[PDB]
Amino acid sequence: TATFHRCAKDPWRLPGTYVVVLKEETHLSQSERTARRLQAQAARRGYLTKILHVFHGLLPGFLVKMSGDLLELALKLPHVDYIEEDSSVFAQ
Ligand SMILES: [Hg+2]
Ligand SMILES: [Hg+2]
Protein backbone atom coordinates (compact mmCIF):
# COMPACT_ATOMS: atom_id res chain seq x y z
CA THR A 1 0.00 0.00 0.00
CA ALA A 2 1.55 3.17 -1.42
CA THR A 3 2.38 6.34 0.54
CA PHE A 4 2.71 10.07 -0.28
CA HIS A 5 5.51 12.40 0.82
CA ARG A 6 6.24 16.11 0.43
CA CYS A 7 8.84 18.50 1.77
CA ALA A 8 8.25 19.55 5.36
CA LYS A 9 9.98 22.84 4.54
CA ASP A 10 6.98 24.46 2.84
CA PRO A 11 8.89 27.17 0.92
CA TRP A 12 10.99 24.37 -0.69
CA ARG A 13 8.06 22.42 -2.13
CA LEU A 14 7.36 22.41 -5.86
CA PRO A 15 3.74 21.26 -6.18
CA GLY A 16 2.38 20.19 -9.56
CA THR A 17 5.23 17.77 -10.36
CA TYR A 18 5.49 14.30 -8.77
CA VAL A 19 8.00 11.45 -8.73
CA VAL A 20 6.12 8.13 -8.87
CA VAL A 21 8.36 5.38 -7.46
CA LEU A 22 7.48 1.83 -8.41
CA LYS A 23 8.45 -1.34 -6.53
CA GLU A 24 12.11 -2.41 -6.74
CA GLU A 25 11.79 -5.13 -9.41
CA THR A 26 9.41 -3.27 -11.76
CA HIS A 27 10.60 -3.48 -15.39
CA LEU A 28 10.91 -0.44 -17.67
CA SER A 29 8.03 -1.72 -19.83
CA GLN A 30 5.84 -1.90 -16.71
CA SER A 31 6.86 1.67 -15.71
CA GLU A 32 5.89 3.06 -19.11
CA ARG A 33 2.55 1.24 -19.15
CA THR A 34 1.76 2.48 -15.61
CA ALA A 35 2.54 6.03 -16.72
CA ARG A 36 0.24 5.79 -19.74
CA ARG A 37 -2.45 4.23 -17.54
CA LEU A 38 -2.24 7.25 -15.20
CA GLN A 39 -2.60 9.63 -18.18
CA ALA A 40 -5.61 7.79 -19.60
CA GLN A 41 -7.36 7.56 -16.21
CA ALA A 42 -6.63 11.25 -15.69
CA ALA A 43 -7.94 12.21 -19.16
CA ARG A 44 -11.18 10.35 -18.49
CA ARG A 45 -11.60 12.65 -15.46
CA GLY A 46 -10.90 15.84 -17.42
CA TYR A 47 -7.28 16.34 -16.35
CA LEU A 48 -4.27 17.18 -18.51
CA THR A 49 -0.98 15.39 -17.61
CA LYS A 50 2.57 15.27 -18.93
CA ILE A 51 5.07 12.46 -18.43
CA LEU A 52 8.35 14.32 -18.13
CA HIS A 53 10.68 11.31 -17.74
CA VAL A 54 10.58 7.55 -17.15
CA PHE A 55 13.25 6.29 -14.73
CA HIS A 56 15.08 3.01 -14.90
CA GLY A 57 18.58 2.02 -13.86
CA LEU A 58 18.56 3.14 -10.24
CA LEU A 59 14.87 3.41 -9.33
CA PRO A 60 11.93 2.42 -11.52
CA GLY A 61 9.11 4.93 -12.02
CA PHE A 62 8.32 8.24 -13.64
CA LEU A 63 8.07 12.02 -13.33
CA VAL A 64 4.65 13.51 -14.00
CA LYS A 65 3.27 17.04 -14.28
CA MET A 66 -0.27 16.86 -13.00
CA SER A 67 -2.71 18.31 -10.49
CA GLY A 68 -2.43 16.97 -6.92
CA ASP A 69 -6.11 16.02 -7.16
CA LEU A 70 -4.95 12.87 -8.99
CA LEU A 71 -2.81 11.66 -6.10
CA GLU A 72 -5.27 9.17 -4.61
CA LEU A 73 -5.87 7.78 -8.13
CA ALA A 74 -2.09 7.50 -8.77
CA LEU A 75 -1.45 5.77 -5.42
CA LYS A 76 -3.85 3.00 -6.52
CA LEU A 77 -1.93 2.21 -9.75
CA PRO A 78 -0.21 -1.19 -10.09
CA HIS A 79 3.45 -1.37 -8.98
CA VAL A 80 3.40 1.96 -7.06
CA ASP A 81 5.64 2.00 -3.99
CA TYR A 82 5.38 5.68 -3.11
CA ILE A 83 4.95 9.14 -4.59
CA GLU A 84 7.06 12.20 -3.76
CA GLU A 85 6.18 15.78 -4.60
CA ASP A 86 9.16 17.53 -6.29
CA SER A 87 11.20 19.97 -4.15
CA SER A 88 14.16 22.37 -4.35
CA VAL A 89 17.84 21.67 -3.76
CA PHE A 90 20.48 24.39 -3.26
CA ALA A 91 24.22 24.95 -3.79
CA GLN A 92 26.05 24.70 -0.45
HG1 LIG B 1 12.22 18.39 0.50
HG1 LIG C 1 11.03 16.98 0.24
Side-chain angles (χ1 to χ4, degrees):
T1 196
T3 51
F4 178 58
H5 308 90
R6 69 193 191 192
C7 205
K9 293 175 180 293
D10 209 71
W12 294 354
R13 295 175 46 208
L14 296 171
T17 302
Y18 301 90
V19 175
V20 184
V21 184
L22 303 186
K23 286 163 179 78
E24 197 205 354
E25 292 147 311
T26 314
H27 188 268
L28 177 59
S29 280
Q30 300 173 301
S31 303
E32 295 170 346
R33 285 168 202 149
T34 302
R36 305 306 148 185
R37 192 196 170 90
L38 178 53
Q39 294 199 280
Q41 290 178 162
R44 179 92 194 93
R45 289 176 186 205
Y47 287 85
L48 229 294
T49 57
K50 198 154 168 256
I51 305 303
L52 300 180
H53 185 84
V54 188
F55 296 95
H56 66 109
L58 294 177
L59 297 172
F62 56 96
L63 183 69
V64 58
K65 191 184 178 283
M66 66 173 198
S67 155
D69 297 6
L70 299 160
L71 279 173
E72 294 279 20
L73 179 69
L75 291 167
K76 279 153 47 206
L77 295 164
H79 311 109
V80 176
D81 187 8
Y82 56 95
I83 303 179
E84 183 171 324
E85 184 194 69
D86 212 358
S87 61
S88 304
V89 296
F90 303 98
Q92 300 296 306

